[PDB]
DNA sequence: GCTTATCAATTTGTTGCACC
DNA sequence: GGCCAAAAAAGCATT
DNA sequence: CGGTGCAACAAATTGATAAGCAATGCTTTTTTGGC
């Protein structure tokens, strides 16, 4: 799978950044998206997609193994809505 | 926060990497991620989340505006699953 | 209006990547 | 970096 | 640059409830590139 290491490697090759800064830019990139989200802000990355926050009320759940009814607690979660551009680039992909 | 605002926030912070460099880097990373998915490969960033492709079977859909039938072939769509650190940090509730 | 995703608790096997 | 108009992408309707 | 250990991660499982989407023209936002 694509990893932080691979992404850093690409920044090194493609933009000639130092391996030290490439490594830090990648980490900063994801951290900056996390920070915005923990701050309740929507992240919209044109050409890729949106990371949105949804507040979910409590609802019925259970222990799949057994069957003990357990309420899925209220929570705010992160969802990703891929844009149309990315959707098109991927619709005919083939899982490696 | 838009893509350009992300670039500005990054640029500011670390005053030891050129603004233009950050612009190029961010754009390049996103293309790298996009192309990875277009290639049918997964993305796995610990603490942030992982991206993969979910299959959608062919089906007889409809133009919801006219009700006309439309034959849709099988396809793949991106799917994102938030990692632990992102889940916890984003979830304000208890 | 129909299809796909969310999630609970728990186990088994896996891996990104921080740390040496 | 700001301005501005044109283009690209996304948003909306409803999706 | 490379070896290692382990928290984070994938997959499975059941079922009530929530989220997402087929087509497409018009509107709105964001990007792009010259000054």
A64 strand E contact, CB < 7 Å? yes
- Ramachandran sector of residue B67 (left: φ over 0; alpha: ψ -120 to 50; beta: rest): left
From start to end of chain A, where are the E strands?
A: 43-45, 49-56, 59-62, 69-72, 75-82
Q: What is the CATH number of the domain that holds B41?
A: 4.10.520.10
Tokens of B27: 């754009």
Task: Determine the residue among A2, A8, A20, A80 to mutate to test chain B binding: the one whose Cβ has the most chain B Cβ atoms within 10 Å.
Answer: A2
Min Cα distance A57 → chain B (Å) is 10
Tokens of A29: 């990139």
Tokens 């009320």 — which residue? A57
Q: Say whether A75 and B26 touch across the interface (CB within 8 A).
A: no
- Structure's resolution in angstroms: 2.0
Residues 6+ apart with CB under 8 A from A25: A8, A11, A17, B10, B17, B22, B25, B26, B29
Q: Which domain holds residue B29?
A: 1-94
Domains annotated for chain A, with CATH where assigned, are: 1-96 (4.10.520.10)
Give per-residue burial for B18-47: e unless 16+ CB within 10 Å, then b: eeebbbbbbebbbebbbebbbeebbbbbeb
* Nearest by CB: B34 against A26, A37, A86: A86
Q: How many domains does chain B have?
A: 1
Give per-residue burial for A41-68: e unless 16+ CB within 10 Å, then b: eebbbeebbebebeeeeeeeeeeeeeee
By what method was this entry solved?
A: X-ray
């Amino acid at each position: 799978a694509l990893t932080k290491a691979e992404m850093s490697e690409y920044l090194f090759d493609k933009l000639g950044l130092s391996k030290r800064d490439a490594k830090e830019l990648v980490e900063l990139f994801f951290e900056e998206i996390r920070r915005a989200l923990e701050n309740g802000e929507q992240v919209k990355l044109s050409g890729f997609g949106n990371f949105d926050l949804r507040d979910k009320n409590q609802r019925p759940g259970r222990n799949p193994k057994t069957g003990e009814d357990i309420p899925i607690t209220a929570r705010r979660v992160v969802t990703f809505r891929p844009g149309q551009k990315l959707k098109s680039r991927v619709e005919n992909a083939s899982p490696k | 926060m838009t893509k350009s605002e992300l670039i500005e926030r990054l640029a500011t912070q670390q005053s030891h990497i050129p603004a233009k460099t950050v612009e190029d880097a961010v754009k390049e990373m996103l293309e790298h991620m996009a192309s990875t998915l277009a290639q049918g490969e997964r993305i796995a960033i610990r603490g942030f989340g992982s991206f993969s492709l979910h299959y959608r079977a062919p089906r007889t859909g409809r133009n919801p505006k006219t009700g006309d039938k439309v034959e849709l072939e099988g396809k793949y769509v991106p799917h994102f699953k938030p990692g632990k650190e992102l889940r916890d940090r984003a979830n304000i509730y208890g």
